[PDB]
Each structure stands twice: as structure tokens, then as C-alpha cells.
Write a protein that binds this DNA or RNA. Structure first.
Ligand SMILES: [Zn+2]
Ligand SMILES: [Zn+2]
Ligand SMILES: [Zn+2]
Ligand SMILES: [Zn+2]
Ligand SMILES: [Zn+2]
Ligand SMILES: [Zn+2]
Ligand SMILES: [Zn+2]
Ligand SMILES: [Zn+2]
Lengths: 111, 112
DNA sequence: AGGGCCCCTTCCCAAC
DNA sequence: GTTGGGAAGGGGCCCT
DNA sequence: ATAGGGCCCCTTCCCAAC
DNA sequence: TGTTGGGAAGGGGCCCTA
């Protein structure tokens, strides 16, 4: 369930997820694309890469017809139609539409 | 409880008794206050470091020249003039840096 | 218990 | 100054 | 044999000085 | 302009004491 990496000593969660993390140290990339033969450290990244060769964006917006490569990217897009800005800075009260936009504002100062 | 997940951000915090310290990063609580300048701190060890401003203590002394410094990074920087050593080196560039964060922002800033 | 698969985060940087 | 696509990496969840 | 406080180490970060 | 660097923020290991 939880284990420390023998190289970086950071805690890795999830059973069987340690070899995947160690590949970020060793750099080994077992999964290879059948077309461009670019190698990848993880299988889910290679699967996403194969869609780049076809241009497939399977997740479509119901309102504007916009296509996205990831289903969670489509949920981020729905905020354009709903106008919802769920992230807010408790010091400024300024709102954002993505979490990293709020994270960028907090690491600054003078706010 | 050498390892525990924070009840707020669900991230793993290591070390016994280290969770309330991490919780204060969420709440902003500053229970440690310098009684001279009234500046508040979230951690006791950060208060001790701040006390050196008033005591003038420079506990980091060089073993060769004997110069005293207030922070460990001052001594490490000062050791460079005794050595000439630049300790951090990229391998996809063989470019040399003086601090660790200089190498990190070089491996993540376009370029090579 | 470990493999797919997906969700989620920040970082970079460009379009706007 | 705001938005967002791509990518790296971590963790939850399902199934066999 | 153990848990918590103190203490000091390390890192990346912003961003200003050089 | 690029490079250097001071200090903040935060996480983790070691030691001492109960
Ligand atoms: Zn590691
Ligand atoms: Zn390919
Ligand atoms: Zn839409
Ligand atoms: Zn704000
Ligand atoms: Zn937390
Ligand atoms: Zn003070
Ligand atoms: Zn010296
Ligand atoms: Zn390089």
C-alpha cells in the first residue's frame, strides 16, 4: 500500500506502483510505439500518444462541439458554459477556473 | 505513527509529531512569537533561527579560516572561495552551477 | 496483489 | 493578466 | 524499546541584486 | 540582458528525554 523508494526515499502509494516510479530515475522505457517507435515509461502514456497519430479527441462538448483528448479536460471546459470559477484565494477573493491558476497566485506575494 | 496522511490534503506526512506542523500550513496558525519584534512563526525551529538576528549568533564557522556565518548556506557559499569547487553539474549540458536550484531550473527551462 | 485505466496535480509556455 | 493544451508524475479504483 | 519535541539538514520557490 | 543568491516555505532524519 505504501513504500519508500530505495533511490529517492519518497513515499510511493499504491500496490505495485514502485517499479513505475523507479523508471523515472533509471529512464528505462519498455513501451514502444508501433509507428514512430518512440518509447515511453508507462503504457497509459503510450495509449494517449497513439491518439496523436490519429488525431482522435474522443470527448466532445455537447454545447459547442469542442473535442478533447481527456474526459477531465472536457469537465474543465464546461465551466466556460456554466461560468463557474470554483477556485478562490481566501486572501484576495479572486476566482480562477483551474487549480494551477490558483496555485500560481499563492506562490507569489504582494497580494 | 511515523507515516500519516493529512486529514485536509490527504498527503503523507512522515515523522512522529510532524502532522500538527503540516496542518498549520493549511490554517495559517502561528503559535510561536518573538517577544522582541513580535513577529510570529508557524514553527519553533524557525523562531530559533530568527533569534540569531537579536543575539547576533553566527554558529556556522569555517574549519579553515574561522569565519562565522548566520546561515548554513553562507558557509557553503564561503567554502567555495576556499575550494573553487562548483558542486552541481548537468550531464546533458556539462554546464556548471553553484546552487542546486540553479540546476533544477536549467533542466526544466527549454534549451537542451 | 498487481495491470490497465483514468483522474488529478503542477509545471511550461503559448494563444489570447 | 487570463486561459488552456501538452506532459510528467502520483494515487484511486476496478477486475481477474 | 518507544513517542514526541527540539534541532538541523535538505529542497524548490520568488525575485531582487550583481 | 543572464547569472548569482538571500530568504521563505516546507518536508524529513537524528538525537535526547520521558
Ligand atoms: Zn524515487
Ligand atoms: Zn508514435
Ligand atoms: Zn463547449
Ligand atoms: Zn489573492
Ligand atoms: Zn495537508
Ligand atoms: Zn525578533
Ligand atoms: Zn574559510
Ligand atoms: Zn543542460
Amino acid at each position: 500500500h505504501m513504500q519508500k523508494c530505495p533511490i529517492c526515499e519518497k513515499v510511493i502509494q499504491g500496490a505495485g506502483k514502485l517499479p513505475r516510479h523507479i523508471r523515472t530515475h533509471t529512464g528505462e522505457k519498455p513501451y514502444e510505439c508501433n509507428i514512430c517507435k518512440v518509447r515511453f515509461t508507462r503504457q497509459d502514456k503510450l495509449k494517449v500518444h497513439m491518439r496523436k497519430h490519429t488525431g482522435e479527441k474522443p470527448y466532445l462538448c455537447q454545447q459547442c462541439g469542442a473535442a478533447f483528448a481527456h474526459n477531465y479536460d472536457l469537465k474543465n471546459h464546461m465551466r466556460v458554459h456554466t461560468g463557474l470559477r470554483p477556485y478562490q484565494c481566501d486572501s484576495c477573493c479572486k476566482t480562477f477556473v483551474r487549480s494551477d491558476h490558483l496555485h500560481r497566485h499563492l506562490k507569489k506575494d504582494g497580494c
